[PDB]
RNA sequence: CUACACCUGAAACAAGCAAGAUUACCCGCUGAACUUAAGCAUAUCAGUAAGCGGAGGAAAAGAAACUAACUAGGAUAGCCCCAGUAAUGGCGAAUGAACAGGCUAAAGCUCAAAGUGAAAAUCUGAAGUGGUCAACACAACAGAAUUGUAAUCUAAAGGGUCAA
RNA sequence: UCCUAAGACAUAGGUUAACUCCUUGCAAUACAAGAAGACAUUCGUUUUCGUUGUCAAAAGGGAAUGAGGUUAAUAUUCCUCA
């Protein structure tokens, strides 16, 4: 299938023609704005791996997110507290920066549901991606037994409750086994849950 | 194609008229006119030395008016009511809250009369 | 600190208003696993209870 | 501005072997040839489909089993070219130039060397299209001739 | 002062009406506890807000 | 002088409904006008009745025009939105029971050659 | 060069979608000091308050890239245990889970990826016709789609050949 | 009420986990954004010229009224006259 032939190809991304193709991608989306629309999804073999499909209700975008690390926010470096908590440069954002391409466009494109999101390059000081939405007041996806779980209230705003692939692997949750159990069920919960005090009425 | 200009601008598109395919609500539909009734215009009647004085006196008539009217409607509104010609409108917003028109009639008419007929005597 | 006794072991070190956890719906709780279990069966009848 | 950039890069850059060999194509002549033969192997339009659908329906259910003759189609897709050029049931290959993103084509001109198929670089992804009752094909191919056509093969 | 919005006037208006006394015949009724209007106010000793 | 019946009015037609509304309001006017210069309690009262009354009227005459405007929208979708449904934004956006329950091919078929039969252990 | 096709972008219009509210519980982020170490920087308070973004009736989680090495077990979640244990810590103050085992509850499924190529078999809208007429069934005509829709398939298989 | 000022805020574009934040009269860190005419008089047709917003002054700018009389309380406002 041809198919098999594109991931290939996608493997070997140091060959002169990768690297050419690459460069110049980079080089149009570095014309085009931040979160554009795209018409078709330039990494098609990908793309139908996540779920997108041809037929109406699907939609592609673009965004460019900037690469780099957390500065912590407060004014002049100026943070009052002990010398654990004073620093700025070296931190790093917990959530990945595949997720916030996924919840950039989700804020852009609020009707529509992120589906999935995947990899279109990156330069020295962006990554562009793009990202599968499904929307959900059209028809096809809504009698599409497949996709219309992701039609229903409790599904709203995925990426931004962590519920995207990205998100899952923000939380650690791509490992399951006793080195995630601590992660399991959201560590907030995890933690609340160990640390409740449990008072029976009988002993 | 040959460019006079030096800047693009946006070609002009066919720009069509906004229509509905379904009438949004009732009203809409049943085409309902808002303008405001000749008798919810005219309110009430005043009896106010002062009002008095100025039917006897000025041939004028003092009325409360809907707050949102204007002058000319209260004109209109006035002389399809009570079949008079009005020579001048003026308006006031009392601080409690209404409008008080002070209205006078051509000589045509007689204030003291449109009284008698309404009771205001 | 004063006796023999051995050393104590911190509980209430952290704020615990918040966590506490209390056991009163196990009464009612109980009974509501019953009648769920019987209308199970109710609903279920010819066949048995627990699958093999 | 863009689109035409695009353009100029692709000019004034290095292109590689793989992107530059999309740029060998039929003269007009032997393009136009091309297109007449295999706009003589076009594939069915729905009123053809329902015609011989209700047609062959109303044979079979009314008089008797007719024998029915196996179709000379014109091959449209990728990964249906791809397959068929892996199974070497394709005769002839011929792919548009003018694809994007290129990757979609690019194995094929290797592959069609290994499997020993000849292929093609036309100018059109609309006149593929044609060929096939679609707005743009990547590639068509060829797989059954009538006795007439070998000549042309 | 002479100035005023619509919106001033209106709300004057309002507290205006606001100000008068209990009806004193409310004060007959079967069910009710109240003498007096606890909340009427004197322009002099306590302030609107109105800017 | 006598109260207003609701069916009794339902029985007339829009226009004389309407007739009658212009002559209830001037009704109302005439009488407010009672209360300002003078006036006996037989007035008071009569304006009480009078406003009530005008509000049965329009009440009836919505109820005809809107009965009329839902005949003609009858049997299409796509009403003004004053007919359409309104229970919770929620409920309208959400799913058919049609594709709540609607199913893809290959479930249909394990449905029909599996499913779930009656079964009785003995003891 | 024209007509025309296709890719890309734009305007107006038709039909639908989002924008705020909610606080107890839920999700993703962000994130301190008081306090305890009888001082105090690590630490502790603590991933705690405050702050931000998202939901729902619950949320999340879930069909192993799990345990365990035994005559093994077998999604997720809660209860009981394991336990104040292994470990972490100016090894100071103090942090601190899980497997096995007893229960409650039980459920398993859909995609990408050689295979329609004897033929897009697919999806959406639809003047309309029947209807329980807002919810259903067909539907002339239109779009989406081979830079691929639907049938088979999802590793517990599966294709091919038989077949009760 | 209109106008512009010191100023200010949208839109567009960009930044942020997000909230927020940065630009814009000499108008933009923006830009396929406008106005007019005529016939038509709807569209449409047609023609012409064209880069793109708003708010901020009851002392600033700012189309034109005066005298006399009247009320318990208004009046360069009502009345009379000009
Ligand atoms: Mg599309
Ligand atoms: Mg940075
Ligand atoms: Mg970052
Ligand atoms: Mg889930
Ligand atoms: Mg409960
Ligand atoms: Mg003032
Ligand atoms: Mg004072
Ligand atoms: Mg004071
Ligand atoms: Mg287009
Ligand atoms: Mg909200
Ligand atoms: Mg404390
Ligand atoms: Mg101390
Ligand atoms: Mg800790
Ligand atoms: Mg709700
Ligand atoms: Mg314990
Ligand atoms: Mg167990
Ligand atoms: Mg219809
Ligand atoms: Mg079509
Ligand atoms: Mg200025
Ligand atoms: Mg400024
Ligand atoms: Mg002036
Ligand atoms: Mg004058």
Same mark, same amino acid.
């Given at each position: &299938? ?30 085009? %704005? ?9 990494? %098609? ?11 109406? &209700? ?16 407060? @004014? ?22 595949? @997720? ?5 466009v989700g804020k852009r494109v609020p009707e ?49 409750? &962590?519920?995207? @692939? ?19 069920? @959201? ?17 | ?121 | ?10 509980? !209430? ?38 699958? !093999? | 501005?863009?689109?035409?950039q695009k353009r100029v890069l692709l000019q004034?850059?290095? =292109? ?100 020993? =198929?000849?292929?093609?670089? =036309? ?31 | ?32 506890? /109240? ?14 807000? /109105?800017? | ?6 069916? *009794? ?6 226009? $004389? ?10 009704? +109302?006017? $005439? ?5 300002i210069a003078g006036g006996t309690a037989n ?28 005949? $003609? ?30 199913? +893809? ?16 252990? *003995?003891?």
């Amino acid at each position: &299938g041809a198919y098999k032939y594109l991931e290939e190809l996608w493997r070997k991304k140091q060959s002169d023609l990768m690297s050419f193709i690459l460069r110049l991608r980079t080089w149009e989306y570095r014309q085009l %704005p931040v979160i554009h629309k795209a018409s078709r999804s330039s990494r %098609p073999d990908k793309a139908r791996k996540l779920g997108y499909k041809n037929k109406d &209700g699907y939609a592609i975008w673009r965004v460019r997110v900037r690469r780099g690390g957390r500065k912590r926010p407060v @004014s002049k470096g100026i943070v009052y507290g002990k010398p654990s908590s004073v620093g700025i440069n070296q931190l790093k954002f917990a959530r990945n920066l595949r @997720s916030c391409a996924e919840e950039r466009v989700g804020k852009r494109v609020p009707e529509l549901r992120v589906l999935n999101s995947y990899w279109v390059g990156q330069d020295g000081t962006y990554k562009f991606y793009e990202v599968i939405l499904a929307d959900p007041s059209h028809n096809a996806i809504r009698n599409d037994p497949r996709i219309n779980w992701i039609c229903e209230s409790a599904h709203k705003h995925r990426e931004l409750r &962590g519920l995207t @692939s990205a998100g899952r692997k923000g939380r650690g949750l791509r490992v399951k086994g006793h080195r995630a159990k601590s992660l399991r069920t @959201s560590r907030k919960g995890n933690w609340r849950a160990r640390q409740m005090l449990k008072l029976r009425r009988y002993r | 194609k040959t460019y006079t200009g030096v800047r693009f601008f946006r070609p002009k598109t066919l720009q069509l008229a906004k229509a509905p395919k379904y009438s949004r609500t009732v009203r809409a539909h049943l085409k309902v006119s808002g303008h405001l009734d000749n008798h919810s215009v005219v309110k009430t009647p005043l009896t106010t030395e002062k009002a008095m004085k100025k039917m006897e006196d000025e041939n004028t008539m003092v009325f409360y008016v809907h707050n949102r009217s204007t002058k000319p409607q209260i004109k209109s509104a006035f002389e399809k009511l009570y079949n008079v010609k009005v020579r001048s409108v003026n308006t006031l917003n009392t601080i409690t809250g209404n409008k008080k028109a002070y209205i006078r009639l051509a000589a045509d008419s007689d204030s003291l009369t449109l009284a008698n007929k309404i009771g205001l005597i | 600190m004063k006796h023999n006794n051995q050393l104590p072991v911190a509980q !209430l070190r952290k704020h615990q208003q918040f966590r506490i956890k209390t056991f009163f719906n196990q009464a009612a709780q109980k009974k509501a696993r019953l009648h769920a279990r019987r209308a199970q069966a109710a609903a279920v009848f010819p066949r048995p209870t627990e699958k !093999l | 501005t863009l689109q035409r950039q695009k353009r100029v890069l692709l000019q004034r850059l290095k =292109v590689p072997p793989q992107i530059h060999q999309f740029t060998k194509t039929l003269d007009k002549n032997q393009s136009s040839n091309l297109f007449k033969l295999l706009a003589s192997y076009a594939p069915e339009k729905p009123a053809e489909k329902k015609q011989r659908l209700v047609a062959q329906a109303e044979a079979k259910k009314d008089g008797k089993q007719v024998e029915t003759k196996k179709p000379i189609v014109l091959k449209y897709g990728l990964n249906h070219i791809t397959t068929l050029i892996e199974n070497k049931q394709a005769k002839l290959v011929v792919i548009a130039h003018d694809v994007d993103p290129i990757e979609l084509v690019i194995f094929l001109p290797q592959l069609c060397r290994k499997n020993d =198929v000849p292929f093609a670089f =036309v100018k059109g992804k609309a006149a593929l299209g044609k060929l096939v009752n679609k707005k743009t094909a990547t590639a068509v191919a060829l797989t059954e001739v009538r006795n007439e056509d070998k000549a042309k093969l | 002062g002479a100035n005023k919005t619509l919106n001033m006037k209106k709300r004057f208006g309002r507290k205006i009406k606001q100000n008068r006394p209990l009806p004193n015949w409310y004060r007959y009724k079967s069910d009710t506890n /109240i003498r007096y209007n606890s909340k009427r106010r004197n322009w002099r000793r306590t302030k609107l807000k /109105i800017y | 002088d006598k109260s207003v019946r609701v069916f *009794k009015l339902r029985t007339q037609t829009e226009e $004389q409904l309407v007739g009658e509304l212009g002559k209830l309001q001037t009704e +109302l006017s $005439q009488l407010r006008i009672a209360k300002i210069a003078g006036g006996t309690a037989n007035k008071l009262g009569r304006i009480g009745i009078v406003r009530k009354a005008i509000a049965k009227y329009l009440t009836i005459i919505n109820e005809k025009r809107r009965q009329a405007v839902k005949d $003609q929208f009858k049997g299409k979708s796509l009403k003004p939105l004053d007919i359409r449904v309104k229970k919770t934004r929620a409920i309208r956006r959400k799913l058919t029971k049609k594709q709540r329950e609607a199913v +893809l091919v290959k479930t249909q078929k394990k449905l029909n050659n599996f499913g779930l039969r009656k079964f009785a252990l *003995k003891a």
